[PDB]
Amino acid sequence: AGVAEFNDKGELLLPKNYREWVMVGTQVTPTEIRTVYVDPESYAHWKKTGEFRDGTVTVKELVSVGDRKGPNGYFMGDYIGLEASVKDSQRFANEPGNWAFYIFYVPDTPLVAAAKNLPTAECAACHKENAKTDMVFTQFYPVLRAAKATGESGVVA
Amino acid sequence: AGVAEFNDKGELLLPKNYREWVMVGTQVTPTEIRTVYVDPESYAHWKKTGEFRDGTVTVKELVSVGDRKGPNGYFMGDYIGLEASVKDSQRFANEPGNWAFYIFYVPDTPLVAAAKNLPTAECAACHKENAKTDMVFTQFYPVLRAAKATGESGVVA
Ligand code: HEC
Ligand code: HEC
């Protein structure tokens, strides 16, 4: 059933300590950096199978960009947004791929402790139309690639 | 003593599964993305104390940049390099801050299974001269900031 926690009305509670999950890719929009996490048990399953288990949770964390000069570059600035997706064949039996999509906050919609699953036109449509693997954009996540192709979570000599 | 493993001649062995460690910041050079990891036990200590324990290992992983068009952005491409640093008051009693610095590979120096600690002019000098906190560039690592300032590894409502 996985790591997702839901309140009585079925809203997804803010995942806890997700920055300790496995970071699978980071993207930059030319302004924003996005960091993508997969919960450790789902990542472990992925290593073994190249599949997203029932109960998989992903988190996408949005940051502004800081500028470094010397001793030049960009770095993760302020946290400005948080999205998540959850796979559950039972709870989301009627959603495409059994995935539900969520916004916790973005440039201003204020932060909620619990989020309602979003309509397919808003989120799932793009994902199911374009994502390489089961509605997750693994074409952009080299941590997952090395994990699936070789069972590894790092370079090996 | 921490997670670092050394061979008989005192060379640091390639850390294993470091992409499962805690990613503390990602940087972009305007061409390359760099991802920075802190081993989970040292991260846990940091959460509690705002200090790098004896035995702390950090890893900096270097990637080329892929280009995404639709459905525009940049993403982590090919792995092209790996550096590490290790704090040990006993093993590195004679190094600045007791930190040793290492290159496993970069655009071509080929990959080694084990790396020798590098001279201070090459690595430690810049770090000890410019890094905010104990020779680690925490001024650029917002995961560590939120962890130290609030004990949190994620946004809380
Ligand atoms: C990244 C994303 C993630 C990370 C996990 C994954 O499925 O890859 C989540 C949980 C999420 N988004 Fe999503 N999205 C798109 C692309 C190309 C990427 C990876 C590349 C990058 O980050 O730069 C995503 C694409 C799209 C998209 C195309 C027009 C739409 C309309 C959406 N995404 C919409 C949503 C959501 C609705 C608010 C939502 C909660 C998402 N995405 C979650
Ligand atoms: C990042 C780095 C890390 C990550 C941990 C940390 O100490 O912050 C390691 C293990 C490492 N480098 Fe390092 N370095 C510099 C800066 C500003 C950052 C963070 C910003 C970013 O990644 O864009 C670093 C600075 C410098 C520098 C200034 C001229 C020098 C000469 C070096 N660094 C040299 C080295 C190493 C010698 C080959 C080496 C093994 C490093 N750094 C490791």
CSV table of C-alpha atoms and ligand atoms in Angstrom, one decimal:
chain,number,residue,atom,x,y,z
A,1,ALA,CA,0.0,0.0,0.0
A,2,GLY,CA,3.1,2.2,0.3
A,3,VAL,CA,4.1,5.4,2.1
A,4,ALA,CA,1.2,7.7,1.1
A,5,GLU,CA,-1.0,8.9,4.0
A,6,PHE,CA,-4.5,10.1,3.5
A,7,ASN,CA,-6.9,11.9,5.8
A,8,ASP,CA,-10.5,10.8,6.4
A,9,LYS,CA,-11.8,12.7,3.3
A,10,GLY,CA,-9.2,11.0,1.1
A,11,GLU,CA,-6.9,14.0,0.7
A,12,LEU,CA,-3.2,13.2,0.4
A,13,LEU,CA,-1.3,14.5,3.5
A,14,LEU,CA,2.0,16.4,2.8
A,15,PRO,CA,4.7,13.6,2.6
A,16,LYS,CA,7.1,13.8,5.5
A,17,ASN,CA,10.9,14.0,5.1
A,18,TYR,CA,10.7,13.4,1.3
A,19,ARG,CA,14.0,15.3,0.8
A,20,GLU,CA,15.5,12.1,2.4
A,21,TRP,CA,13.9,10.0,-0.4
A,22,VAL,CA,15.9,9.0,-3.6
A,23,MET,CA,16.4,12.0,-5.9
A,24,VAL,CA,15.9,10.7,-9.4
A,25,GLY,CA,16.5,13.7,-11.6
A,26,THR,CA,16.8,17.5,-11.5
A,27,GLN,CA,15.6,19.8,-14.2
A,28,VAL,CA,16.1,23.5,-14.9
A,29,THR,CA,13.7,25.8,-16.8
A,30,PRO,CA,15.3,28.7,-18.7
A,31,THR,CA,14.3,30.6,-13.7
A,32,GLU,CA,13.4,27.4,-11.8
A,33,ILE,CA,15.0,24.2,-10.7
A,34,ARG,CA,12.9,21.1,-10.1
A,35,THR,CA,14.0,18.2,-8.0
A,36,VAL,CA,12.2,14.8,-8.3
A,37,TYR,CA,12.1,12.2,-5.5
A,38,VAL,CA,10.8,8.6,-5.4
A,39,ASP,CA,10.1,7.1,-2.0
A,40,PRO,CA,12.9,4.6,-0.9
A,41,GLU,CA,10.8,1.4,-0.9
A,42,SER,CA,9.4,2.1,-4.4
A,43,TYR,CA,12.9,3.0,-5.6
A,44,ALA,CA,14.1,-0.4,-4.2
A,45,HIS,CA,11.4,-2.2,-6.1
A,46,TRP,CA,12.3,-0.3,-9.2
A,47,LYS,CA,16.0,-1.4,-8.9
A,48,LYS,CA,14.8,-5.0,-8.8
A,49,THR,CA,12.1,-4.8,-11.5
A,50,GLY,CA,12.1,-1.6,-13.6
A,51,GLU,CA,8.5,-1.1,-12.5
A,52,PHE,CA,6.7,1.3,-10.3
A,53,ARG,CA,5.0,-0.7,-7.5
A,54,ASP,CA,1.5,-0.3,-6.4
A,55,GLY,CA,1.8,2.5,-3.7
A,56,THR,CA,4.6,4.4,-5.5
A,57,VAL,CA,4.9,8.0,-4.4
A,58,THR,CA,6.8,10.7,-6.4
A,59,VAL,CA,7.4,14.3,-5.3
A,60,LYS,CA,8.5,17.2,-7.4
A,61,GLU,CA,9.9,20.1,-5.5
A,62,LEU,CA,10.1,23.5,-7.1
A,63,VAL,CA,12.9,26.1,-6.3
A,64,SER,CA,13.9,29.5,-7.5
A,65,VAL,CA,17.5,29.9,-8.7
A,66,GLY,CA,20.3,31.6,-6.8
A,67,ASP,CA,23.3,33.1,-8.6
A,68,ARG,CA,26.9,32.2,-7.5
A,69,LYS,CA,29.8,34.4,-8.6
A,70,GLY,CA,33.2,32.8,-8.0
A,71,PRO,CA,35.3,31.6,-6.3
A,72,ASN,CA,30.2,31.2,-11.6
A,73,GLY,CA,27.0,29.3,-11.5
A,74,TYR,CA,23.4,28.7,-10.4
A,75,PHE,CA,22.2,26.9,-7.3
A,76,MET,CA,18.8,26.0,-5.6
A,77,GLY,CA,17.4,29.1,-4.0
A,78,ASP,CA,14.0,29.4,-2.3
A,79,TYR,CA,11.4,26.7,-2.1
A,80,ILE,CA,8.4,27.9,-4.1
A,81,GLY,CA,6.3,24.8,-4.9
A,82,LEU,CA,5.6,21.1,-4.3
A,83,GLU,CA,3.7,18.6,-6.4
A,84,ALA,CA,3.2,14.8,-5.9
A,85,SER,CA,1.8,11.8,-7.7
A,86,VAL,CA,0.6,8.5,-6.1
A,87,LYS,CA,0.0,5.2,-7.8
A,88,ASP,CA,-2.7,3.0,-6.2
A,89,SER,CA,-4.7,0.4,-8.2
A,90,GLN,CA,-7.3,0.2,-5.5
A,91,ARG,CA,-7.7,3.8,-4.3
A,92,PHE,CA,-7.3,5.2,-7.8
A,93,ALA,CA,-9.0,2.4,-9.7
A,94,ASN,CA,-10.7,4.9,-12.0
A,95,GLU,CA,-7.7,7.2,-12.8
A,96,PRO,CA,-5.5,6.7,-15.9
A,97,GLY,CA,-2.7,4.3,-14.9
A,98,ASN,CA,-4.1,4.4,-11.3
A,99,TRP,CA,-2.1,7.6,-10.7
A,100,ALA,CA,-3.5,10.6,-8.7
A,101,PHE,CA,-1.8,14.1,-9.1
A,102,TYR,CA,-1.5,16.8,-6.4
A,103,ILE,CA,-0.4,20.4,-5.8
A,104,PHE,CA,0.6,21.3,-2.3
A,105,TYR,CA,1.6,24.9,-3.3
A,106,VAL,CA,2.9,26.8,-6.3
A,107,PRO,CA,3.7,30.5,-6.9
A,108,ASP,CA,0.8,31.6,-5.0
A,109,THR,CA,-1.7,29.0,-4.3
A,110,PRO,CA,-0.9,28.9,-0.6
A,111,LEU,CA,0.3,25.7,1.1
A,112,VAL,CA,-2.2,23.1,2.2
A,113,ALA,CA,-1.6,20.4,4.8
A,114,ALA,CA,-3.7,18.0,2.6
A,115,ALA,CA,-4.3,18.1,-1.2
A,116,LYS,CA,-7.2,16.9,-3.3
A,117,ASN,CA,-6.5,14.8,-6.5
A,118,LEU,CA,-6.5,16.9,-9.6
A,119,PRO,CA,-8.6,16.5,-12.8
A,120,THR,CA,-7.0,14.5,-15.6
A,121,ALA,CA,-7.0,17.5,-18.0
A,122,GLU,CA,-4.9,19.4,-15.5
A,123,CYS,CA,-2.2,16.8,-14.9
A,124,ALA,CA,-2.7,13.1,-15.9
A,125,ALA,CA,-3.4,14.0,-19.6
A,126,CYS,CA,0.1,15.4,-20.2
A,127,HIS,CA,1.8,12.6,-18.3
A,128,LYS,CA,0.0,9.7,-19.9
A,129,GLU,CA,0.5,11.4,-23.3
A,130,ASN,CA,4.2,12.0,-23.1
A,131,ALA,CA,5.9,10.2,-20.2
A,132,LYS,CA,8.2,7.3,-21.2
A,133,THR,CA,7.2,4.9,-18.4
A,134,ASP,CA,3.9,4.5,-16.6
A,135,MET,CA,3.1,8.2,-16.5
A,136,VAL,CA,6.5,9.2,-15.0
A,137,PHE,CA,9.0,11.1,-17.2
A,138,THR,CA,11.8,8.6,-16.7
A,139,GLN,CA,13.3,9.7,-20.1
A,140,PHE,CA,14.7,12.6,-18.0
A,141,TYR,CA,15.8,10.7,-14.8
A,142,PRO,CA,19.2,9.0,-15.2
A,143,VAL,CA,19.2,7.7,-11.6
A,144,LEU,CA,16.3,5.4,-12.5
A,145,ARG,CA,18.0,4.5,-15.8
A,146,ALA,CA,21.2,3.2,-14.2
A,147,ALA,CA,19.1,1.5,-11.4
A,148,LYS,CA,16.9,-0.3,-14.0
A,149,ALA,CA,19.7,-1.1,-16.6
A,150,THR,CA,22.4,-2.2,-14.1
A,151,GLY,CA,20.8,-2.5,-10.6
A,152,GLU,CA,23.2,0.2,-9.5
A,153,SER,CA,22.8,3.5,-7.5
A,154,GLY,CA,26.2,5.0,-8.5
A,155,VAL,CA,29.1,4.5,-10.8
A,156,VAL,CA,30.9,1.2,-10.3
A,157,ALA,CA,34.5,0.7,-11.5
B,1,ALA,CA,34.1,6.4,12.0
B,2,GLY,CA,31.4,6.6,9.4
B,3,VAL,CA,30.6,5.1,6.0
B,4,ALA,CA,34.0,5.7,4.2
B,5,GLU,CA,35.9,2.5,3.2
B,6,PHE,CA,39.6,2.6,2.5
B,7,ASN,CA,41.9,0.0,0.9
B,8,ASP,CA,45.1,-1.2,2.5
B,9,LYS,CA,47.1,1.6,1.1
B,10,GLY,CA,44.7,4.2,2.5
B,11,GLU,CA,42.9,5.1,-0.8
B,12,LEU,CA,39.2,5.8,-0.6
B,13,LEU,CA,37.1,3.2,-2.4
B,14,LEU,CA,34.3,4.4,-4.6
B,15,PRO,CA,31.3,4.9,-2.3
B,16,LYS,CA,28.5,2.4,-3.0
B,17,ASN,CA,24.9,3.5,-3.7
B,18,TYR,CA,25.6,7.1,-2.9
B,19,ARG,CA,22.7,8.2,-5.2
B,20,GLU,CA,20.5,6.8,-2.3
B,21,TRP,CA,22.1,9.3,0.1
B,22,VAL,CA,20.6,12.6,0.9
B,23,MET,CA,20.9,15.1,-2.0
B,24,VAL,CA,21.6,18.5,-0.4
B,25,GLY,CA,21.9,20.8,-3.4
B,26,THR,CA,22.1,20.8,-7.1
B,27,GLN,CA,24.1,23.4,-9.1
B,28,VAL,CA,24.3,24.4,-12.8
B,29,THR,CA,27.3,25.9,-14.5
B,30,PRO,CA,26.4,28.1,-17.5
B,31,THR,CA,27.0,23.1,-19.6
B,32,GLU,CA,27.1,21.0,-16.4
B,33,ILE,CA,24.8,20.0,-13.5
B,34,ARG,CA,26.3,19.0,-10.2
B,35,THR,CA,24.5,17.0,-7.6
B,36,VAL,CA,25.8,16.9,-4.0
B,37,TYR,CA,25.1,14.1,-1.5
B,38,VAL,CA,25.7,13.6,2.2
B,39,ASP,CA,25.6,10.1,3.6
B,40,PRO,CA,22.4,9.4,5.6
B,41,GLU,CA,23.9,9.0,9.1
B,42,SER,CA,26.0,12.2,8.8
B,43,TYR,CA,22.8,14.0,7.5
B,44,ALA,CA,20.9,12.7,10.5
B,45,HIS,CA,23.6,14.1,12.8
B,46,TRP,CA,23.4,17.4,10.9
B,47,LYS,CA,19.6,17.6,11.5
B,48,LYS,CA,20.2,17.2,15.2
B,49,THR,CA,23.3,19.5,15.6
B,50,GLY,CA,24.1,21.6,12.6
B,51,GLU,CA,27.5,20.0,12.5
B,52,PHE,CA,29.4,17.6,10.3
B,53,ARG,CA,30.2,14.5,12.4
B,54,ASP,CA,33.6,12.9,12.4
B,55,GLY,CA,33.3,10.4,9.5
B,56,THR,CA,31.1,12.6,7.3
B,57,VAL,CA,31.3,11.7,3.6
B,58,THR,CA,30.1,14.0,0.8
B,59,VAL,CA,29.9,13.2,-2.9
B,60,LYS,CA,29.6,15.5,-5.8
B,61,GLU,CA,28.4,14.0,-9.0
B,62,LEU,CA,28.9,15.7,-12.4
B,63,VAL,CA,26.6,15.4,-15.4
B,64,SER,CA,26.3,16.9,-18.8
B,65,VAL,CA,23.0,18.6,-19.6
B,66,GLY,CA,20.2,17.2,-21.8
B,67,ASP,CA,17.7,19.5,-23.6
B,68,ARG,CA,14.0,19.0,-23.4
B,69,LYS,CA,11.6,20.5,-26.0
B,70,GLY,CA,8.0,20.5,-24.9
B,71,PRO,CA,5.5,19.1,-24.1
B,72,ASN,CA,11.2,23.5,-22.7
B,73,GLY,CA,14.0,22.8,-20.3
B,74,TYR,CA,17.2,21.1,-19.3
B,75,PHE,CA,17.8,17.8,-17.5
B,76,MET,CA,20.6,15.6,-16.2
B,77,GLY,CA,22.3,13.9,-19.1
B,78,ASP,CA,25.4,11.7,-19.0
B,79,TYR,CA,27.4,11.0,-15.9
B,80,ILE,CA,30.9,12.6,-16.6
B,81,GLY,CA,32.5,12.9,-13.2
B,82,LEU,CA,32.6,12.1,-9.5
B,83,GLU,CA,34.3,13.8,-6.5
B,84,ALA,CA,34.2,13.1,-2.8
B,85,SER,CA,35.3,14.6,0.5
B,86,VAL,CA,35.8,12.8,3.8
B,87,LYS,CA,36.1,14.2,7.3
B,88,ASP,CA,38.1,12.1,9.8
B,89,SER,CA,40.0,13.8,12.8
B,90,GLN,CA,42.1,10.6,13.2
B,91,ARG,CA,42.9,9.5,9.6
B,92,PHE,CA,43.3,13.1,8.4
B,93,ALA,CA,44.7,14.6,11.5
B,94,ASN,CA,47.1,16.7,9.4
B,95,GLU,CA,44.7,18.0,6.7
B,96,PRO,CA,42.9,21.4,7.1
B,97,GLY,CA,39.6,20.8,9.0
B,98,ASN,CA,40.5,17.1,8.9
B,99,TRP,CA,39.0,16.8,5.4
B,100,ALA,CA,40.5,14.8,2.5
B,101,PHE,CA,39.4,15.5,-1.1
B,102,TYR,CA,39.2,13.0,-4.0
B,103,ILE,CA,38.6,12.6,-7.7
B,104,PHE,CA,37.2,9.4,-9.0
B,105,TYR,CA,36.9,10.6,-12.6
B,106,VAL,CA,36.3,13.9,-14.5
B,107,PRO,CA,36.3,14.7,-18.3
B,108,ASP,CA,39.0,12.4,-19.1
B,109,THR,CA,40.9,11.3,-16.2
B,110,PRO,CA,39.5,7.7,-16.4
B,111,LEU,CA,37.6,6.2,-13.5
B,112,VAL,CA,39.6,4.6,-10.6
B,113,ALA,CA,38.1,2.1,-8.1
B,114,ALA,CA,40.2,3.8,-5.4
B,115,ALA,CA,41.3,7.4,-5.1
B,116,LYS,CA,44.3,9.1,-3.4
B,117,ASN,CA,43.7,12.2,-1.2
B,118,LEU,CA,44.6,15.3,-3.2
B,119,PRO,CA,47.0,18.2,-2.3
B,120,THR,CA,45.5,21.2,-0.4
B,121,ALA,CA,46.4,23.6,-3.3
B,122,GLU,CA,44.2,21.6,-5.6
B,123,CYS,CA,41.1,21.2,-3.4
B,124,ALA,CA,41.1,22.0,0.3
B,125,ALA,CA,42.5,25.6,-0.2
B,126,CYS,CA,39.4,26.8,-2.1
B,127,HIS,CA,37.0,25.1,0.3
B,128,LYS,CA,38.6,26.3,3.5
B,129,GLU,CA,38.9,29.8,2.0
B,130,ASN,CA,35.3,30.1,0.8
B,131,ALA,CA,33.0,27.5,2.1
B,132,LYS,CA,30.4,28.8,4.7
B,133,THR,CA,30.6,25.8,7.1
B,134,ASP,CA,33.5,23.5,7.9
B,135,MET,CA,34.9,23.4,4.3
B,136,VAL,CA,31.4,22.5,2.8
B,137,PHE,CA,29.6,25.0,0.6
B,138,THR,CA,26.4,25.0,2.7
B,139,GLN,CA,25.6,28.5,1.6
B,140,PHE,CA,24.3,26.8,-1.6
B,141,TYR,CA,22.6,23.7,-0.1
B,142,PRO,CA,19.0,24.6,1.1
B,143,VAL,CA,18.2,21.0,2.2
B,144,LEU,CA,20.9,21.4,4.9
B,145,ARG,CA,19.6,24.9,5.8
B,146,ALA,CA,16.0,23.7,6.4
B,147,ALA,CA,17.4,20.6,8.3
B,148,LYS,CA,19.6,22.8,10.6
B,149,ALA,CA,17.2,25.7,11.1
B,150,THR,CA,14.0,23.7,11.6
B,151,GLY,CA,15.0,19.9,11.9
B,152,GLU,CA,12.9,19.3,8.8
B,153,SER,CA,13.5,17.4,5.6
B,154,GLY,CA,10.6,18.9,3.7
B,155,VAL,CA,8.0,21.7,3.8
B,156,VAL,CA,5.7,21.4,6.8
B,157,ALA,CA,2.2,23.1,6.9
C,1,HEC,C1,7.3,16.4,-13.7
C,1,HEC,C2,6.3,16.0,-12.7
C,1,HEC,C3,6.5,15.1,-11.6
C,1,HEC,C4,7.7,14.2,-11.3
C,1,HEC,C5,7.3,12.7,-11.5
C,1,HEC,C6,7.0,12.4,-13.0
C,1,HEC,O1,5.9,12.0,-13.3
C,1,HEC,O2,7.8,12.6,-13.9
C,1,HEC,C7,5.3,15.2,-10.9
C,1,HEC,C8,4.9,14.4,-9.6
C,1,HEC,C9,4.4,16.1,-11.6
C,1,HEC,N1,5.1,16.6,-12.7
C,1,HEC,FE1,4.1,17.2,-14.4
C,1,HEC,N2,5.8,17.0,-15.6
C,1,HEC,C10,5.9,17.2,-17.0
C,1,HEC,C11,7.2,16.9,-17.4
C,1,HEC,C12,7.8,17.0,-18.9
C,1,HEC,C13,8.0,16.6,-16.2
C,1,HEC,C14,9.5,16.2,-16.1
C,1,HEC,C15,10.4,17.3,-16.7
C,1,HEC,C16,10.6,18.6,-15.8
C,1,HEC,O3,10.3,18.6,-14.6
C,1,HEC,O4,11.1,19.6,-16.4
C,1,HEC,C17,7.0,16.6,-15.1
C,1,HEC,C18,4.8,17.5,-17.8
C,1,HEC,C19,3.6,18.1,-17.4
C,1,HEC,C20,2.7,18.8,-18.2
C,1,HEC,C21,2.9,19.0,-19.8
C,1,HEC,C22,2.1,20.2,-20.4
C,1,HEC,C23,1.6,19.1,-17.5
C,1,HEC,C24,0.3,19.9,-17.9
C,1,HEC,C25,1.9,18.6,-16.1
C,1,HEC,N3,3.1,18.0,-16.1
C,1,HEC,C26,1.0,18.8,-15.0
C,1,HEC,C27,1.3,18.3,-13.7
C,1,HEC,C28,0.4,18.5,-12.5
C,1,HEC,C29,-0.9,19.3,-12.5
C,1,HEC,C30,-0.8,20.5,-11.6
C,1,HEC,C31,1.0,17.8,-11.5
C,1,HEC,C32,0.5,17.7,-10.0
C,1,HEC,C33,2.3,17.2,-12.0
C,1,HEC,N4,2.4,17.6,-13.3
C,1,HEC,C34,3.2,16.5,-11.2
C,2,HEC,C1,31.6,21.6,-4.5
C,2,HEC,C2,32.3,20.4,-4.1
C,2,HEC,C3,31.9,19.3,-3.2
C,2,HEC,C4,30.5,19.2,-2.6
C,2,HEC,C5,30.7,19.3,-1.0
C,2,HEC,C6,31.2,20.7,-0.6
C,2,HEC,O1,32.3,20.7,0.0
C,2,HEC,O2,30.5,21.7,-0.8
C,2,HEC,C7,32.9,18.4,-3.2
C,2,HEC,C8,33.0,17.1,-2.4
C,2,HEC,C9,34.0,19.0,-3.9
C,2,HEC,N1,33.6,20.2,-4.4
C,2,HEC,FE1,34.9,21.8,-4.8
C,2,HEC,N2,33.4,23.2,-4.8
C,2,HEC,C10,33.6,24.6,-4.9
C,2,HEC,C11,32.3,25.2,-4.8
C,2,HEC,C12,31.9,26.8,-4.9
C,2,HEC,C13,31.3,24.1,-4.7
C,2,HEC,C14,29.7,24.3,-4.5
C,2,HEC,C15,29.2,25.0,-5.7
C,2,HEC,C16,29.0,24.2,-7.0
C,2,HEC,O3,29.1,23.0,-7.1
C,2,HEC,O4,28.8,24.8,-8.1
C,2,HEC,C17,32.1,22.9,-4.6
C,2,HEC,C18,34.8,25.2,-5.0
C,2,HEC,C19,36.0,24.7,-5.4
C,2,HEC,C20,37.2,25.4,-5.9
C,2,HEC,C21,37.2,26.9,-6.1
C,2,HEC,C22,38.3,27.4,-7.1
C,2,HEC,C23,38.1,24.5,-6.1
C,2,HEC,C24,39.6,24.7,-6.7
C,2,HEC,C25,37.6,23.1,-5.8
C,2,HEC,N3,36.3,23.3,-5.3
C,2,HEC,C26,38.2,21.9,-5.9
C,2,HEC,C27,37.8,20.7,-5.5
C,2,HEC,C28,38.4,19.4,-5.6
C,2,HEC,C29,39.9,19.2,-6.2
C,2,HEC,C30,39.9,18.4,-7.5
C,2,HEC,C31,37.6,18.4,-5.1
C,2,HEC,C32,37.8,16.9,-5.0
C,2,HEC,C33,36.4,19.1,-4.7
C,2,HEC,N4,36.5,20.4,-5.0
C,2,HEC,C34,35.3,18.5,-4.1
